[PDB]
Every structure is written in structure tokens, then in C-alpha cells.
Design a protein around this ligand. Structure first.
Ligand SMILES: NCCc1c[nH]c2ccc(O)cc12
Ligand SMILES: NCCc1c[nH]c2ccc(O)cc12
Lengths: 342, 367, 367, 365
């Protein structure tokens, strides 16, 4: 009890421990990651669980002692991109600080590879107000060699490595910047089942629908039901994939491409249904665009007028849709290869 | 005591009282200089109220009790002492709904002439006016006001550390990510007085903000126009006694899904739904009317039913409305002419929808 | 000489002991006038029955130790004593389930006669009843009980700064743009006694609020009405025709999705579900029953599976039904009477839904 | 002259020092009565294994240094002393995780015989083992232990202000319209000792909370059973080789939306998913299998190949006993579709049975 009274008398919080104020103090911090947490995909902020572990170098306190955090000085080393009591002090001249934190740090998020995304984010360390001409953050050891190889970890933590430069930080002329880039990976299984699994069947059922007779009215009902299916799947699209200034990911483009393609197919099918003997109306073609289109096809009552053109247009659209499906498959293969590479 | 930093700090904080305002004459109000630099507007979340933002905040007021003269002390020109030892003005936001989670930092700089610098980040959450009538092409005008919560004008006064024209166009450190882009910050100085004649000092920072609708356009708009163009052929291309019974209900369910999608991302507000939602409701009503028409004039009601006398004065109307616009046979003719009328109404509705989307885009771009 | 403020603050705070109730006679209670201004209703959580609201709170008590003659201290009649340096009473809301992220105001005005004014913004997370039987046309009242945690009437007595009418009809700074509209704030003071000699002062503010249902009406009421209307009008199709089968199938798919998201959207409390959830699940059951009727119809005529069996239950039940409403052929007649019965049931259900909506709106608008 | 309250407070705290046990004698201990009243169960995070409550915790210890004759201080028989100027028992919670944000009450009465009372609201966050295997019909049993911390009895003897019967039915102030229903608060007294030399004193405020399933009845159970019935009637209605693939994929999309809602509603634990997530996943798997088989059969029949004959013998012998070369393919597709329908009916029967069994266990409490 009386030990604290003696030590607290000859100590001031506001002053830096220095023999002379010209000499700059040295502060060391080692960042410990654990249990990576949810990342808000909106490209605004990500939340992670961290351990601080700050080590000091020189203090004018000499005589294990436990003291409240308000009885010893703690430097205001914080994070530049940052949003949202017992002290382990030794009599030899070293102090230890134990406190868990959540960064909830703002960063730049990449969605263009959803859901197989391996994005990079930074953890910059500095002091918000200190000029840091005397409290530089030169570290005790280099975390590059030791931290990178192994760590103690819906998201996967992959690699955290440091990087330093002298002059930086925009709040003031701050000498403290030891950036901690963070690499994370996402579990895609739930996202795969929720998005890719129902969508890929929406690519193969439409192929099956092309086997139906184009002139038959049953294909119209099939396309109507698939249009309702895309209407329903739009809810999944809106709920699952996030919003970003870059827009929808590379997967989201193919969804609207296939929806537009099926809309065009349905419109063509309905037009052919009208123009075949169901309604016909002896409607003639100008015979100019007809022969032009026939010449284009040449390289890779009222029956032949409409049935042939409808069939060839349906075959062309089926080829286009199969090409779109192949592009989708290639995109997923490439995304999975690049994500599993990391 | 050889470094004498302890001596300097204890000399400045010897007879200093934190609670007393630092003025030699009590009749002179203390003037606070405010600098606000935007960082992000992350997590706008619900659009009924609330606006989350991150700013970098500064304060510059002169303390007359910390005017220690140099050339006799350690010859320093800059001292840092904890914020818990000096008087700090009670500057607060009127819309200060949530304090948020921000690191409260000590050690405000104190100059050798007494000037105090109070750099501090603020993770603000404020309540402002959010008009979603033009969604997704939305531009919002939210206020970040700063005022003394309890001190009056003759106690605390508010000024700007830099001229307003510098504040408007100094979005330097702002990160240009997320769905929202900051356009303008407008500082204005309007006094505050609610009940009695104790004049307050209030400064308004009008944060003009803009939304990027690219994702929203791709996700919600382009499918909507696809359903419009499906309806346009659907009214005229499929004839009666066909698949129209399933067609109209399927597109009606699609429009209902569109209303659902608009609803989930847009919270309840004094305005019911944006203009796009109003047009979706109108198209749903038109589809209901078309379905009622088809069922009532085709199939079991009229096509299968026989010897049902249908008179009325509508045949007198079609002798004139068909000129203005341009029992089985009678039923087919009346169904066809009313279907053409519904075609014209829906074509007008789609034209109005496209025109209003163009108008909203023009307003959003010309902001 | 010393500044006027420093001398006055030293004179007031010398030999001043907080934690002692500032009265020169301990037998007279300290009257703490209370005034509350409602600023915003941040959130009304029916899940946890907690009301999140933001109010501007003012206190008013007389400290008999902080009295000074204005003739001295250079004619000063007001000060800024820190809050944590004097006696501040123990009034707090009994309904707290969370303190809230309310900023602290470290200053008060002490007048030259001892009158102390406390201004602070309170972010309240308080428990309520939150009956959702009338959703969306929902009117709810919440109490804000201000009483001292452990001070009786003989120690602390709570009154109103303003007259009850002024508190009731304030509507000054409230944000009239959210989901909830503030109807009134009803203050009334009742002495609360746990026993015969431990009466406690208590002030109750009744925050009566009213939801804005236009958004919910457009999002939920219009689609959920159009869908049942088209379901009614689709019974005009022949019961035995296969065109109704696809109609029923796709209507089932769309309406099932619609109800999935609706049931996700609707709130739920301990009492159960709103009055419209009953009609929604009733329509669920009715649509399932209609599809089962189609199942029975299709198997009769699509194949020869049901042609061989004959009705063993006879027409007695069917005869009673046709009296109440007013081999194949027999099965088709059974299908027709069941279809007519389901038509009556749908008509009754939709009529009841419309009457319920009208009654809910009339209750909501009247009060 | 001097105010009675001011003079009395000056006299009481002049010789008083915080940190020393108020009992003048060095032998007999300091009894500390306790009275805990539950107000609300704010949050139960099963993933983090933290129980967030809100109690009204009261202490009644008879201080000995705060004794005064009323006749000497203008008949003041009761005084309000700041809680930071006198000794207060250091009773903490053994299951402590976080203290939360609770209002600060800085006053405590002392009577003319030194009878201090300390009422305080606590937004406690405690760690208790939570099992969600019976969601939403789950009954939890979370402890609440108040310990002596520094003192090792014969200094502080924690006792109850009221008998366990009074504290058991503390529903006079509870907000009983939330998700969790407070069943009982049963206190248990037991002494634990680090060493045989001396023992500690503690209480065990067993708090049993039962979840109200009516919150999720319309959100999960009714939509789930509606989708089960819809899947059944969608197996029944369309022909197996007919125009069903479009309807089946629309149904699959709807049920995937339902699973999105479920994942946004159900809670997650390190133990695993509740008993209904298994049924949801099983129904998804069977629906996907049915859609894939129907797609395969329709593709083969529209291909126009007759039978592999490595399975026809077993299908006729075994698979057929569930109860034009493409015609045999259509028949075997129909047989497998009927088998899948029977499997789905068995699965929905199991789902219906387990819900009543879970409800009965929940109702048994
Ligand atoms: N910035 C608000 C200052 C203010 C002026 N009048 C008030 C009345 C109550 C209150 O809490 C605050 C105020
Ligand atoms: N002085 C008010 C004490 C108090 C607070 N909450 C209470 C609830 C019930 C009661 O009898 C008393 C109280």
C-alpha cells in the first residue's frame, strides 16, 4: 500500500521521461492478431479483434507492482484510419500494457472478385496530436521475418506484414508511421450455395428450354416461368452481394446479361408465336432484310417465310446463350483459382 | 528536476483552476476557433434519420492564465499538458444523437503565448433531413452544427480558423470510397434562441452529399426496364385465349418483387415511397386492371358462356373514342378496343417512367 | 489584483462540501424543477420492447451555499461552476435498460441567489409495452418516470419547470420526418410510497407517438391486397381446365416468396403477431387448400386413375353444401361445389381483410 | 449557526478513513445482506457465450463508525453520505465479463445507528453456457455468483436480505414481454476455499430463462411448414417428365430465399446448428436432387441413346417396392421421382414430430 504512495509522489503524467528534452524517447509496439471478425463489404469499414502489447524503453521510475492506468503515463499512439486498469510495471525500468481492442478500421475493399476475393487492408500507427519529433515509433524487433510465417488465428486471416517510412501522417508533422498491411480471405461456401448454386441451374434449365419446339406455345410458358425465377433471384442478388462505388462484381454483370438475353429470347418467341399460323395474318417481310440476314447466315401457307427465320434466330440466340454460360464457367474457374492460390 | 519539464508544468498548473473561464476581464467572451476536415460519411444506414460521419476537429482558444514568458525557463516554445488540467469550451452538436466510439486523447498543446490546440477526431452520428424522393439519384443536405451547449454568447463565441471559401474546397484527406461522395461543406453562422432571450452562438456546417447510383442502377433499374419492355410486347403480341393469364400474373409478381426490393433498403419515412416506387405501384395497378379485363371478357365468363346479353352505352362510346384514338363478336370487339386503350395507357406510363428517370439523372448530375 | 471570476469561484468553493444537501434547514425538501423537450425517436424496438429516444433535459434547484452579493466581484450575477464540484440531485429514469451514449456537460449556471441550472442531452434506452396488434396503424404511449433513486419527498421533491400545457404542446425541436410522429407529452406528478413513511416523489411524462404507415401501406398493403384480388378474379377460370393449373402454380410460387419476405418484415412480440399476420397465414392456408383442390381435379380428368373409383361418400354432404351455399359427372359436380365454396371463403376473407384495414385506419386517425 | 447536515457530515467523516473495515472489534465479522431483483434480459449472445442482464443490486451492512446521537445534531436520524467517502463491501461477480454502462448512484443513507444501504442498478454481462440445440424451444440455466474477492470470511459474511422464497418470485418489476421469459431466480449458498486454512463466502443466483417461441413462430416455423407443404404439392401435381423443371427451379429459388432468411435469423454457436437447420439442409438437398434428376430425365427423353440394365433388375426388385425405347427411361424416372416424394414425406413427418417433442420439453418447464 505504502509502496504506491512513494512512487506516485515523484512522477508527473504530462511530462515525457527524459534526462534532457532534446533526447527523443523510443516506443515499441508489437501487434497480435486473433479471431478475424466480420468485414462490412460496403467498402467502408472492417472489424477485427486485436491485442496491443505496448513495450516502453525509458522511464524515471525506480524503487512486481500493479497500478491503475491513471497512475502511469501511456502515450497516445493511435491508428490514422480508425473508427468506432492494472499496469504490469517492473522495478528494473520496463512497463507492460495489456489491453484487447477492435480496430473497426476504414479501408478500401475490393468486390470485383466476389465471392472469391483476397483483398488487402492497412493498419497505420501514429499519434493523433503529438509532433512525434521525440516519441518516434521505431520498433524493438522486425515483425517481417517472425510474424509472416505463422500467427495465432466467416473470414480467414492470411498475412500481416509491416512497412515504415519517416515523414507521413496528415493530422500533423508526425514521424510515427509503421504501416501494418493485412491480407484476409473469405469463406465462400455459404455464398456459393446461396448465389452460385441456384444461378448455375438458371443457366442450364434455359439450355433445356431450347430443346422445346419454338413454334409451340409451351416454350412461352417455360420462358415466363424462368422470368419469374429471375424476378425471385433478384432478391438473392440484392441481399447477398454488396454495394460499392465500383458497382456490382464481375459475377453481377453476367446475371443481368443472362436476364437480358432471356428477355430477348422471350420477346422473339412471342413474336414468332404471333407470326406463325396461330395468328399469321399473312404478314409479309420486306424481302430485303430477309435476304441480307440469309446471306449473313451463309457463313458461320406463310410457313417458310416465318418458320425458317424464327428457327435460325433461335439457334443464333442459343449459341449466344451457350457462349455466355461458357464465359460464366471460365470466370468462376479463374476466380476460384486466384482465390485458392492465396 | 534537471530537465525541469516537471518544474515548467507545475509552474503553469500551480494556481490554475480548471473550472474558471480563462479571461482577465469577465465581460469579454472567449473566442473559439473551429476547424472541421471531413474523413468519411460511412454507415449512412437507415435513411429515415441518423447520419454517421467521421471528421477531424480542431479548437484554438487563447488562455490568459498560461502566458508564461520564455528566456527565463528551459527556453522552450512548446509545451504539452493533459486536457484534464485546463478549461475546455463546451462546444457540442445540436444533432449530437450519439457520441460514437472515439479515442479521447489527452495532451493539448499549449504555446508560450497561451494558445491551446485541441486536435481531436470525432466519429459523429447526427440526425438530419434525408429526402429519398429521388432515389437512387439522391443528393442530401445534412447539417453538422457546432454550438456551446450551456455557455451563451457573452460566455463563449464561435469563429472559423480559416475563411469559408477555404472550408468549402479543401476536401483533401477525404477518402473517395463507398456509396456516398461528399460534394460541399458550407459554413454558416446563425444564432440560436429557443425559449428566452439568452442568446447562444451557433455555427452551421452544411454537408452537401451525393450518392453513386451505379450499383443501384444495375441491380434495380435495368431489370425494371426489362419488365417494362416485356409488358409492352405482352399486352399486344400474345392474343386472348392464350398464355396471357400466366403472363400478366408473372409480371405482376415481378413488380411486387420490385416493390419488396425497394422496401428493404428504404426505411419508413414521411414520404411513402420514391417516384420509382410510385411508378411500380401504378404498373401493378395497370396489370391488375388488364388481368381483370382478360378474365372478365375472355374464357369462362364470356368466351365459354353463351346467350348472355351485353348491352350498355359503351358501344355508343366506342363510336367516338375509336375515332379520337385512331354476342361473341361483340365481346371480342369490346375486349380488343379496351385492350388497345390499356395499351395506350401503359405506353404512356412507360414513357413517363423513362422521362422521369432521365430527369432524375439530370438533376443528380447537375448538382 | 486577482480576476473577478477567480475570487468569486474561490469564495464559493472554499469550505464547500458536496454530498451535503444544500439547505439551512434539513426539514424542508429541495424542489428540483424538471423540464423535458423531446428531440427525436431514434428507434422503437418491438423485439426487445426498448424505446430509444433523445431528449433535451433541464434541471432547476436552489443551492443555498452558492450565494454571493453581486456588489462584490466586479458586479457578476452568474457563474459556470463545474458539475462535479457541487451537489447535483439523483433524478434518473426508472425505465433505463441502458444509460446511452449521452455526452457529459461539465458546467452549470449558478446565479447570485443560489439558483442552479443544469442542461444536458439525454439519450434514453427505456422499456415500453409496444403493442403491435394494430400494425402498421400503430399508436403507442411510453412513460418517462423521473424520480430520485433513493431520496424521499422529505428530501427531494420533483416539480415541473413549465406548466403542463406548455410541456404537452411543445413540438418545438422534434424531427417531424421519421417513422414515428410525436402526438403529445403528458406530464403528471404522483407521490409514490413503498410504505406508510417512505413516500417518494415521482414525475411521469407520457410520450404518446403515432407511426407513419404510408410506407408500410404501399410496401405491404397494396401488394398483399392486389394478390388476393387477382386470386379472387382468377376463380372465373373453369375448375377442370388445365389453364387454371399453371395459373395456380405460378401464383403459388410468387405469393409464397412474397409471404416469406413479408413474414421476415413483420414485427413480433410476446403477444404474438399483428392483426394482418392472421389474414396472411389464413391466405396461406387458403391458397394451399385451393392447390389441393386442383390436385383432386387434375387427377380426375388428366389420366384414368380416378375414373375407375366411384364416390363412396355419396352426395349427401354435397347436397347439404349446395343447399348451404345457395361417374365423372359426379366428380365434376363435386369439384364445382368445392370451387364455389372456396370462392365464398376467399370473398369472405378478403372482405374481412378490407374491413379490418378500414377499422385499423379509422382507429389510428381518430386518436 | 452551522447547518445540522453540514456539521453532522463534518463530524462523521473527520476521523473516518476509507479502506479499513468499519467494525471496531478485530474479531467478529461484518455481515453484508444482499438483495438482487431482475429487471430485464437485454441480450443473450450464444455465439459469444455472454448473458446481458439488468438487475437492482442492494446491500445492507451495519457500519459502526457512522453512529451519532440524534439529539446532538438537531434530531437528524438519517443522513445521505457519498458512497466514495466510506467503506463499501468489495462484492463482485465470479462470472464477470464486462460491467456495462450503468447509472452512477453516488449516495447511500446511514441511520443514527450506522445502518448503510446501497441500492444500485447493474447492467451485468456474465458468461454462461448456452445451448441452442432446441431452438426456439430452449430453456437456459445461467448462474450468477457473488463472491467475497479479497476477504476470506470472518470478515464479510454474505447473507440474504430476504429468504430465497421472496427472491425466487421477483417478477414484480420484470419486463416480461421480451423474447426471454424469466422462470426463477434460485439462490444457493456454499463456501469455497482455496486452502484448508480459510474459506470464502458466495451466493449462486441461478437464473433460469425460457425463450418465447411465438417470436419465431411466424418467422421460421410457419414459413418452413408452408414451404414443406408447397414442396409436397409440387411433387404431386406436375407430370414427372412434363413441364416441371421451370416450376422446380422457381421453387428452388424461393426456398433459397427462405434459407437466406433463416441464416439471417438463426443464431450460431461453436456447438453447432439447432435441430431445425439440419431439416432445412436436408430438404434443400432433396429438392436439389429432385430438380437434377428431372433435368436429366427430360434431357434424355428429348435427346431421342434403351436401358443400362445394370440397375433395372434392382429397381424393379427393390426400388419399385417403395409402397419407344425412351418409355422405359420415362418409367424409371417416374419411379425415382416417386421414391424421392416418399423420402420427402418421411422427412416432413420427422420435422413435424420433432417440433412437438421440442415443444413438450419446453412446455414441461
Ligand atoms: N445547444 C442547445 C442549447 C440549449 C438551448 N436551450 C436549451 C434547453 C435545453 C437543453 O437541453 C439545451 C438547450
Ligand atoms: N426512489 C425510487 C426507488 C425505486 C426505483 N424503482 C423502483 C421500483 C419499485 C419501487 O417500489 C421503488 C423503486
Amino acid at each position: 500500500l505504502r509502496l504506491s504512495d512513494h512512487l506516485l509522489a515523484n512522477y508527473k503524467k504530462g511530462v515525457r521521461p527524459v534526462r534532457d528534452w532534446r533526447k527523443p524517447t523510443t516506443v515499441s509496439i508489437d501487434v497480435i492478431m486473433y479471431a478475424i471478425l466480420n468485414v462490412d463489404e460496403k467498402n467502408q469499414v472492417l472489424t477485427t479483434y486485436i491485442w496491443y502489447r505496448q513495450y516502453w524503453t525509458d522511464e524515471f521510475l525506480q524503487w512486481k507492482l500493479s497500478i491503475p492506468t491513471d497512475s502511469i503515463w501511456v502515450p497516445d499512439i493511435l491508428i490514422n484510419e480508425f473508427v468506432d486498469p492494472y499496469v504490469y510495471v517492473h522495478h528494473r525500468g520496463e512497463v507492460q500494457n495489456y489491453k484487447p481492442l477492435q480496430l473497426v478500421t476504414a479501408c478500401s475493399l475490393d468486390i470485383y472478385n466476389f465471392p472469391f476475393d483476397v483483398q488487402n487492408c492497412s493498419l497505420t500507427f501514429t499519434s493523433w496530436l503529438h509532433t512525434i519529433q521525440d516519441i518516434n515509433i521505431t520498433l524493438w524487433r522486425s515483425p517481417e521475418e517472425v510474424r509472416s510465417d505463422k500467427s495465432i488465428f466467416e473470414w480467414e486471416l492470411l498475412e500481416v506484414f509491416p512497412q515504415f517510412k519517416e515523414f507521413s501522417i496528415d493530422i500533423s508533422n508526425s514521424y510515427a508511421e509503421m504501416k501494418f498491411y493485412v491480407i484476409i480471405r473469405r469463406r465462400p461456401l455459404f455464398y456459393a450455395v446461396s448465389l452460385l448454386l441456384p444461378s448455375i441451374f438458371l443457366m442450364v434449365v434455359d439450355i433445356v428450354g431450347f430443346c422445346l419446339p419454338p413454334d409451340s406455345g409451351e416454350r412461352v410458358s417455360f420462358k415466363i416461368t424462368l422470368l419469374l425465377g429471375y424476378s425471385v433471384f433478384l432478391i438473392i442478388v440484392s441481399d447477398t452481394l454488396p454495394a460499392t462505388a465500383i458497382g456490382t462484381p464481375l459475377i453481377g454483370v453476367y446475371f443481368v446479361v443472362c436476364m437480358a438475353l432471356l428477355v430477348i429470347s422471350l420477346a422473339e418467341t412471342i413474336f414468332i408465336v404471333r407470326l406463325v399460323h396461330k395468328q399469321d395474318l399473312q404478314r409479309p417481310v420486306p424481302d430485303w432484310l430477309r435476304h441480307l440476314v440469309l446471306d449473313r447466315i451463309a457463313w458461320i401457307e406463310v410457313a417458310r417465310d416465318w418458320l425458317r427465320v424464327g428457327y435460325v434466330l433461335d439457334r443464333l440466340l442459343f449459341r449466344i446463350y451457350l457462349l455466355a454460360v461458357l464465359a460464366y464457367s471460365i470466370t468462376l474457374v479463374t476466380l476460384w483459382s486466384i482465390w485458392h492460390s492465396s
